[PDB]
Structure 1
Amino acid sequence: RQNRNQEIFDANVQRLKEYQSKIIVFPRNGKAPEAEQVLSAAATFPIAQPATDVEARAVQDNGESAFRTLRLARSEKKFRGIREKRAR
């Protein structure tokens, strides 16, 4: 798995740091105290969906007609190849 997303990489790093700070490693020389294991590590670190947006925000607009923007984007991709040939 490659890393090409700052947000996901940072989330994974934070998860690793939390896991390291929450685990206790007994010394290899014995004398390990009571463990009291937890049968599920994923339960202690449940996967949480990042919040996409807040519940409410101040309304701002520019009159760009987002539907018009979608139509323009769809049209541009169709004729780009023909446009480049027509340019010469």
Structure 2
Amino acid sequence: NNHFRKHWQRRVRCHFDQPGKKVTRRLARRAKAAALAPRPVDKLRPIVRCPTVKYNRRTRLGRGFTLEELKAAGIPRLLAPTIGIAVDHRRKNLSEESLAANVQRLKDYKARLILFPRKSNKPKKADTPKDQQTAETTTSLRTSFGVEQPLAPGFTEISKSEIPAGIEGGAYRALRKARSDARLVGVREKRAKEKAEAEANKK
């Protein structure tokens, strides 16, 4: 299985510029940090659960916070990108748990946020006062507001009196019964409607 039957030597890509490109990326990161200081170098990202049955055990960072999350946390959608929060209008909150977790995340960010006034001489009521603008600050939101607990805890201890009884008939039998019922959904419905029609005909 060797795929060398085309003119492969015309488009061989070597990577002797790997350390140089790393140095270039680090210089760009320094320049971006210096331009954005004292703001963090990145935006705040939500916690989302990966799709498919393979990766739904693990959580990761998403694109941006939903409009429902912003409304529940009390941040307007026009102010949110101007204070370091990513906004995603495509994502929806189908369940309460992810919504609550992201609202708590936004509330923690708003509690730890320092907001400087637009004009120095005229601070407003929503702005951080000068005696509170001085504190230790973070520059990496991906570190300070990362995914703390990506997977569920794999080990927990319970007392022997609290051991569950379990599914009646056995877990293996429960799985077999669930599979069999799923495969026999429509046959039983056809039989039931045929029996109902026969009962209506010969009542």
SS at 2:119's partner residue? Answer: coil
Q: 1:47 aligns with which of 147, 150, 155?
A: 147
Distance 1:28 1:45, change over 3 A: same
Task: Supply the distance in 1 between the matched residues of 2:153 and 2:117 (Cα, whole angstroms).
Answer: 43
Indicate conservation of the 8 Å contact 2:93/2:99, yes or no: yes
Unaligned segments of structure 2, at least 5 residues: 1-90, 122-129, 195-203
Q: TM-score, normalised by structure 2?
A: 0.38
Query: 1:7 corresponds to which residue?
Result: 97
Q: 1:68 aligns with which of 155, 162, 173?
A: 173
Task: Supply the distance in 2 between the matched residues of 1:43 and 1:79 (Cα, whole angstroms).
Answer: 50
Alpha-carbon shift at residue 59 of structure 1 (Å): 1.0
SS at 1:3's partner residue? Answer: coil
**Identical amino acids, percent of aligned pairs:** 40
Distance 1:54 1:24, change over 3 A: same
Alpha-carbon shift at residue 30 of structure 1 (Å): 2.3
Query: 2:115 corresponds to which residue?
Result: 25
Task: Supply the distance in 1 between the matched residues of 2:191 and 2:181 (Cα, whole angstroms).
Answer: 14
Distance 1:34 1:62, change over 3 A: closer
Unaligned segments of structure 1, at least 5 residues: none
Indicate conservation of the 8 Å contact 2:167/2:174, yes or no: no
Alpha-carbon shift at residue 36 of structure 1 (Å): 6.8
SS at 1:55's partner residue? Answer: strand
Q: TM-score, normalised by structure 1?
A: 0.80
Alpha-carbon shift at residue 54 of structure 1 (Å): 6.6
| Largest Rg, 1 or 2 | 2
Say which is worse superposed, 56-65 or 76-85, in terms of deviation: 56-65
Query: 1:38 corresponds to which residue?
Result: 138
Query: 2:163 corresponds to which residue?
Result: 59
Query: 2:187 corresponds to which residue?
Result: 82
Alpha-carbon shift at residue 66 of structure 1 (Å): 1.0
Task: Supply the distance in 2 between the matched residues of 1:23 and 1:8 (Cα, whole angstroms).
Answer: 22
Task: Supply the distance in 2 between the matched residues of 1:46 and 1:52 (Cα, whole angstroms).
Answer: 17
